[PDB]
Design a protein around this motif. Structure first.
Motif, PDB file in Angstrom:
ATOM      1  N   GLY A 305     -87.645 -15.211  80.059  1.00  0.00           N
ATOM      2  CA  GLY A 305     -87.871 -16.568  80.531  1.00  0.00           C
ATOM      3  C   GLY A 305     -87.447 -17.725  79.622  1.00  0.00           C
ATOM      4  N   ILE A 306     -86.619 -17.478  78.603  1.00  0.00           N
ATOM      5  CA  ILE A 306     -86.127 -18.581  77.813  1.00  0.00           C
ATOM      6  C   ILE A 306     -84.954 -19.164  78.601  1.00  0.00           C
ATOM      7  CG2 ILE A 306     -85.704 -19.432  75.473  1.00  0.00           C
ATOM      8  CD1 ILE A 306     -88.010 -17.587  75.469  1.00  0.00           C
ATOM      9  N   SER A 307     -85.130 -20.439  78.991  1.00  0.00           N
ATOM     10  CA  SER A 307     -84.256 -21.172  79.918  1.00  0.00           C
ATOM     11  C   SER A 307     -82.888 -21.352  79.315  1.00  0.00           C
ATOM     12  CB  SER A 307     -84.864 -22.544  80.197  1.00  0.00           C
ATOM     13  OG  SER A 307     -84.704 -23.415  79.078  1.00  0.00           O
ATOM     14  N   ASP A 308     -81.847 -21.496  80.136  1.00  0.00           N
ATOM     15  CA  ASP A 308     -80.487 -21.704  79.593  1.00  0.00           C
ATOM     16  C   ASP A 308     -80.479 -22.950  78.697  1.00  0.00           C
ATOM     17  N   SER A 309     -81.394 -23.867  78.975  1.00  0.00           N
ATOM     18  CA  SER A 309     -81.519 -25.083  78.184  1.00  0.00           C
ATOM     19  C   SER A 309     -82.066 -24.804  76.762  1.00  0.00           C
ATOM     20  CB  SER A 309     -82.415 -26.074  78.921  1.00  0.00           C
ATOM     21  OG  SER A 309     -82.129 -27.364  78.471  1.00  0.00           O
ATOM     22  N   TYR A 310     -83.219 -24.149  76.729  1.00  0.00           N
ATOM     23  CA  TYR A 310     -83.810 -23.784  75.470  1.00  0.00           C
ATOM     24  C   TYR A 310     -82.883 -22.859  74.660  1.00  0.00           C
ATOM     25  CZ  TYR A 310     -88.469 -25.960  75.692  1.00  0.00           C
ATOM     26  OH  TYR A 310     -89.556 -26.834  75.694  1.00  0.00           O
ATOM     27  N   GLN A 311     -82.126 -22.030  75.347  1.00  0.00           N
ATOM     28  CA  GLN A 311     -81.176 -21.112  74.726  1.00  0.00           C
ATOM     29  C   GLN A 311     -80.078 -21.846  73.982  1.00  0.00           C
ATOM     30  OE1 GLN A 311     -79.045 -17.783  76.960  1.00  0.00           O
ATOM     31  NE2 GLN A 311     -81.135 -17.504  77.776  1.00  0.00           N
ATOM     32  N   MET A 312     -79.556 -22.863  74.652  1.00  0.00           N
ATOM     33  CA  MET A 312     -78.584 -23.795  74.089  1.00  0.00           C
ATOM     34  C   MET A 312     -79.178 -24.554  72.885  1.00  0.00           C
ATOM     35  SD  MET A 312     -75.748 -23.488  75.388  1.00  0.00           S
ATOM     36  CE  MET A 312     -75.047 -24.892  74.354  1.00  0.00           C
ATOM     37  N   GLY A 313     -80.485 -24.807  72.930  1.00  0.00           N
ATOM     38  CA  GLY A 313     -81.192 -25.388  71.816  1.00  0.00           C
ATOM     39  C   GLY A 313     -81.174 -24.462  70.620  1.00  0.00           C
ATOM     40  N   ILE A 314     -81.439 -23.172  70.853  1.00  0.00           N
ATOM     41  CA  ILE A 314     -81.418 -22.185  69.794  1.00  0.00           C
ATOM     42  C   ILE A 314     -80.092 -22.299  69.086  1.00  0.00           C
ATOM     43  CG2 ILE A 314     -81.558 -19.750  69.111  1.00  0.00           C
ATOM     44  CD1 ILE A 314     -83.998 -21.073  70.640  1.00  0.00           C
ATOM     45  N   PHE A 315     -78.989 -22.213  69.818  1.00  0.00           N
ATOM     46  CA  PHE A 315     -77.688 -22.178  69.133  1.00  0.00           C
ATOM     47  C   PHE A 315     -77.293 -23.541  68.548  1.00  0.00           C
ATOM     48  CE2 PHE A 315     -77.311 -19.196  72.845  1.00  0.00           C
ATOM     49  CZ  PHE A 315     -77.671 -18.039  72.141  1.00  0.00           C
ATOM     50  N   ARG A 316     -77.933 -24.613  69.028  1.00  0.00           N
ATOM     51  CA  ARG A 316     -77.705 -25.956  68.488  1.00  0.00           C
ATOM     52  C   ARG A 316     -78.320 -25.999  67.096  1.00  0.00           C
ATOM     53  NH1 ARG A 316     -74.793 -30.185  71.004  1.00  0.00           N
ATOM     54  NH2 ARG A 316     -75.441 -32.311  70.463  1.00  0.00           N
ATOM     55  N   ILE A 317     -79.566 -25.539  66.987  1.00  0.00           N
ATOM     56  CA  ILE A 317     -80.243 -25.371  65.685  1.00  0.00           C
ATOM     57  C   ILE A 317     -79.487 -24.484  64.685  1.00  0.00           C
ATOM     58  CG2 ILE A 317     -82.237 -24.391  64.561  1.00  0.00           C
ATOM     59  CD1 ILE A 317     -82.621 -27.120  65.905  1.00  0.00           C
ATOM     60  N   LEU A 318     -78.829 -23.455  65.194  1.00  0.00           N
ATOM     61  CA  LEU A 318     -78.194 -22.474  64.344  1.00  0.00           C
ATOM     62  C   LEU A 318     -76.857 -22.971  63.871  1.00  0.00           C
ATOM     63  CD1 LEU A 318     -79.386 -19.559  66.464  1.00  0.00           C
ATOM     64  CD2 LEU A 318     -79.685 -19.574  63.996  1.00  0.00           C
ATOM     65  N   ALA A 319     -76.124 -23.632  64.749  1.00  0.00           N
ATOM     66  CA  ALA A 319     -74.871 -24.246  64.326  1.00  0.00           C
ATOM     67  C   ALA A 319     -75.216 -25.334  63.289  1.00  0.00           C
ATOM     68  CB  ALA A 319     -74.141 -24.796  65.517  1.00  0.00           C
ATOM     69  N   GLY A 320     -76.244 -26.098  63.615  1.00  0.00           N
ATOM     70  CA  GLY A 320     -76.835 -26.997  62.660  1.00  0.00           C
ATOM     71  C   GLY A 320     -76.925 -26.404  61.272  1.00  0.00           C
ATOM     72  N   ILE A 321     -77.630 -25.272  61.159  1.00  0.00           N
ATOM     73  CA  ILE A 321     -77.914 -24.637  59.866  1.00  0.00           C
ATOM     74  C   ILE A 321     -76.618 -24.258  59.218  1.00  0.00           C
ATOM     75  CG2 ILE A 321     -78.703 -22.442  58.833  1.00  0.00           C
ATOM     76  CD1 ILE A 321     -81.159 -22.681  60.667  1.00  0.00           C
ATOM     77  N   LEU A 322     -75.698 -23.691  59.985  1.00  0.00           N
ATOM     78  CA  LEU A 322     -74.443 -23.249  59.398  1.00  0.00           C
ATOM     79  C   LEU A 322     -73.731 -24.433  58.757  1.00  0.00           C
ATOM     80  CD1 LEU A 322     -73.407 -21.180  62.551  1.00  0.00           C
ATOM     81  CD2 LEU A 322     -73.527 -20.230  60.207  1.00  0.00           C
ATOM     82  N   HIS A 323     -73.643 -25.542  59.489  1.00  0.00           N
ATOM     83  CA  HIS A 323     -72.876 -26.724  59.030  1.00  0.00           C
ATOM     84  C   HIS A 323     -73.538 -27.361  57.825  1.00  0.00           C
ATOM     85  CE1 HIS A 323     -69.517 -27.140  61.745  1.00  0.00           C
ATOM     86  NE2 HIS A 323     -70.306 -26.887  62.777  1.00  0.00           N
ATOM     87  N   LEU A 324     -74.853 -27.265  57.805  1.00  0.00           N
ATOM     88  CA  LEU A 324     -75.632 -27.797  56.734  1.00  0.00           C
ATOM     89  C   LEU A 324     -75.256 -27.129  55.447  1.00  0.00           C
ATOM     90  CD1 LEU A 324     -77.837 -29.571  55.762  1.00  0.00           C
ATOM     91  CD2 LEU A 324     -79.456 -27.684  56.324  1.00  0.00           C
ATOM     92  N   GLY A 325     -74.907 -25.857  55.514  1.00  0.00           N
ATOM     93  CA  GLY A 325     -74.650 -25.089  54.324  1.00  0.00           C
ATOM     94  C   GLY A 325     -73.377 -25.556  53.692  1.00  0.00           C
ATOM     95  N   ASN A 326     -72.534 -26.209  54.492  1.00  0.00           N
ATOM     96  CA  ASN A 326     -71.255 -26.718  53.999  1.00  0.00           C
ATOM     97  C   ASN A 326     -71.291 -28.132  53.447  1.00  0.00           C
ATOM     98  OD1 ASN A 326     -68.806 -24.965  56.003  1.00  0.00           O
ATOM     99  ND2 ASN A 326     -70.508 -24.279  54.702  1.00  0.00           N
TER     100      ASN A 326
END
Length: 722
Positions: A305-326
């Motif tokens: 039940g994790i919505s396509d919206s919340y799912q997109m949020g997950i990967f938004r946070i994760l891309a976030g983290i990756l870019h932060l490392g740079n």
């Protein structure tokens, strides 16, 4: 002592490179103060004059093949090894009791042993009545929930890939058939591997945290749902990886699906583009397609039940983290630094996250101190700012990991009130590589701690067996791990020092090493220092001795997140998730070591409030081959599982246990009708008092005789002589 067992035609076990042990008969009778041993496998085994130690004796056939490892008379590694091997290969038995422990060898194939017929055979039975099976362990847990009015825990340890998820599924299949949890919990596994597993130098899919899943029951003791807790997460991994290793699976999944139309926006490069995911120099796992594995993860999210919206949020946070490392830093001087202007990494960080480049750029390079007078902002070095960047990343990740667990939990929770639970723990066992660092140090510490709590449970139960049997219970010895655990976690111990040093402006890896020496070397037997190095320590852990390289320890342990850095993020708007993550100040001054200790005492509390049962899962080979047994890998697994220590402890007391009848009915042929009285229990005492002269090789209790190691093999030998 005499040692009239090394006779001629007596089997022993000698070492072997390919098989670890070879079975070897006898030719000459061993003479006291000899130095040889003629053998026809044909050689002359030569022991070493100082050790004067004879190869371990082999067990008599009536005992070989037994369902319980602690019914061997000679309890040692070869016997255990041989016993598990013949049951697995010759007889296809994956399950073997080790006292109250279930040993499960992964057969790497689907076996027709989990149907309703078998389930039914096991409901109602008592432990040991039947052949060892995961179902027996479930039965005990379920039966005891009902009769003791007390929650239970089945701990399932071992390396990932050893069959722990199989064991948990059939505990659930079993619970659901003697009382739709199982389908939902297994559907979650890929969500949980993607965020919590990672390739290491030695497992392409290593699980880096403990998973406890509370299976809920109502007052009519039926299943209503499940609730997952997690502990011990390896936060270090999010920002650092050793050679040959990777960050958590989900990061790589994302970067190999960068070209997908709906991740255009996340402006993701491939995995060698990011600091947080290229350090290991090996982004692709042979035979693993990270892009295909991403569709399974979303499908799993969808299915809980994790919505396509919340799912997109997950990967938004994760891309976030990756870019932060740079985000790179240029220092102005030893005490301050800055983010280059028009700097891509933070541009993208900030666009994704939904915050102001400048306010972020500022709290990435400054720090708010507070005192009773008032507050003040100071600049901070490039170094302290790496440490703060990393801490933030770790903190984002950790809370995203908790977010995703809550929302699995919502799919699993039931409205029906819950009266009790049985929790399945999926924990790792011991981990040693050629190079060992902070992460292994944490796993091993947890392992001493889970081993202590197992030893203390066994020891309670032994004391209880003795009281019933009217032998004085104080005669039981304890083999205590508390000194190793204090060495790790007590004031002035390894972790306390690591904390102290991390707070020292000049403190480094080499200066912490020195405090380890000056505090413990020559003052604590569990602590050795390699003769040829100043950058490494050794701990005498229960299972094995382990060398740790100090490199990296001080950086990995640091974990001070800055509140200003958070609040920036805690205030986004173009993005519902991110502020949800953070819905205090002492909690994030805390190092990773310290949080680890808290998570671990949380885990012990949880388990101590319950009755534990134990399952040890081993890999027999390194290639997922069906029913194939590699001796070198088997020993390593049993060792890293605690089974070899479990068995040593056992082997030092009174492991064999015959009832007076079992004994009379085996060894009748050994007595003469003259000494056969009408009292069965009394005949045996007398009969055995003659057959074995030394009295402390056995203890007589109410209904059983208890024997020392080797005493049943002695009996069985003079049953053959005759």
């Amino acid at each position: 002592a005499a040692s009239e067992l090394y006779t001629k035609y007596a089997r022993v076990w000698i070492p072997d490179p390919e098989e670890v042990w070879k079975s070897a008969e006898l030719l000459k009778d061993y003479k006291p103060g000899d130095k040889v041993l003629q053998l026809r496998l044909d050689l002359e085994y030569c022991l070493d004059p100082k050790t004067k130690e004879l190869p371990p004796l082999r067990n008599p056939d009536i005992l070989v093949g037994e369902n319980d490892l602690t019914a061997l008379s000679y309890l040692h590694e070869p016997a255990v090894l041989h016993n598990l091997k013949v049951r697995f290969i010759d007889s296809k038995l994956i399950y073997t009791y080790c006292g109250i422990v279930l040993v499960a060898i992964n057969p790497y194939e689907q076996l027709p042993i989990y149907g309703e017929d078998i389930i039914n055979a096991y409901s109602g039975q008592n432990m040991g009545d039947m052949d060892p099976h995961i179902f027996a362990v479930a039965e005990e847990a379920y039966k005891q929930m009902a009769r003791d009015e007390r929650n239970q825990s089945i701990i399932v340890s071992g390396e990932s890939g050893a069959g722990k998820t199989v064991s948990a599924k059939y505990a659930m299949r079993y619970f659901a058939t003697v009382s739709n949890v199982e389908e939902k919990v297994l559907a979650s596994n890929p969500i949980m591997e993607s965020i919590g597993n990672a390739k290491t130098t030695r497992n392409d899919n290593s699980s880096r945290f403990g998973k406890y899943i509370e299976i809920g029951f109502d007052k009519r003791y039926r299943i209503i749902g499940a609730n997952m807790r997690t502990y011990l997460l390896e936060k270090s991994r999010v920002v650092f990886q050793a050679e040959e290793e990777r960050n958590y699976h989900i990061f790589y999944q994302l970067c190999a699906s960068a070209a997908l139309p709906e991740f255009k926006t996340l402006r993701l490069g491939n995995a060698n583009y990011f600091h947080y995911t290229k350090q290991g120099g090996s982004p692709v796992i042979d035979g693993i397609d990270d892009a295909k594995e991403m569709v399974n993860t979303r499908q799993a999210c969808t299915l809980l039940g994790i919505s396509d919206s919340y799912q997109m949020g997950i990967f938004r946070i994760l891309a976030g983290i990756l870019h932060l490392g740079n985000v790179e830093f240029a220092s102005r001087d030893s005490d301050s630094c800055a983010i280059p202007p028009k700097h891509d990494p933070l541009t993208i960080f900030c666009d994704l996250m939904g915050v102001d480049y400048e306010e972020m750029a500022h709290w990435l390079c400054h720090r708010k101190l507070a005192t009773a007078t008032e507050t003040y902002i100071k600049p901070i070095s490039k170094l302290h700012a790496i440490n703060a960047r990393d801490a933030l990343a770790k903190h984002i990740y950790a809370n995203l990991f908790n977010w995703i667990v809550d929302h699995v939990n919502k799919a699993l929770h039931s409205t029906v009130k819950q009266h009790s639970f049985i929790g399945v723990l999926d924990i790792y066992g011991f981990e040693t590589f050629e190079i060992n660092s902070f992460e292994q140090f944490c796993i091993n510490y947890a392992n001493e701690k889970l081993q202590q709590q197992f030893n203390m449970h066994v020891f309670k139960l032994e004391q209880e067996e003795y009281m019933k049997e009217q032998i004085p219970w104080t005669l039981i010895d304890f083999y205590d791990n508390q000194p190793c655990i204090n060495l790790i976690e007590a004031k002035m111990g390894v972790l306390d020092l690591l904390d102290e040093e991390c707070k020292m402006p000049k403190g480094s890896d080499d200066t912490w090493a020195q405090k380890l020496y000056n505090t413990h070397l020559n003052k604590c037997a569990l602590f050795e220092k390699p003769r040829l190095s100043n950058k490494a320590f050794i701990i005498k852990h229960f299972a094995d001795k382990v060398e740790y390289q100090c490199e990296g320890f001080l950086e990995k342990n640091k974990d001070t997140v800055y509140e200003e850095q958070i609040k920036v993020l805690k205030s986004s708007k173009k993005f519902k998730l991110l502020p949800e993550l953070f819905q205090t100040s002492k909690e994030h001054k805390k190092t990773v070591g310290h949080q680890f200790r808290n998570s671990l005492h949380l885990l012990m509390e949880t388990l101590n409030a319950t009755t534990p049962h134990y399952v040890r899962c081993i890999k027999p080979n390194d290639f997922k081959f069906p029913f194939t047994f590699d001796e070198k890998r088997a020993v390593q697994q049993l060792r890293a599982c605690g089974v070899l220590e479990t068995i040593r402890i056992s082997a030092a007391g009174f492991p064999s246990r015959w009832t007076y009848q079992e004994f009379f009915s085996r060894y009748r042929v050994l007595m003469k009708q003259k000494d056969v009285l009408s009292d069965r229990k009394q005949t045996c005492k007398n009969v055995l008092e003659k057959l074995i002269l030394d009295k402390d090789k056995y203890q007589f209790g109410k209904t059983k005789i208890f024997f020392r190691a080797g005493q049943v093999a002695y009996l069985e030998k003079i049953r053959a002589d005759k």
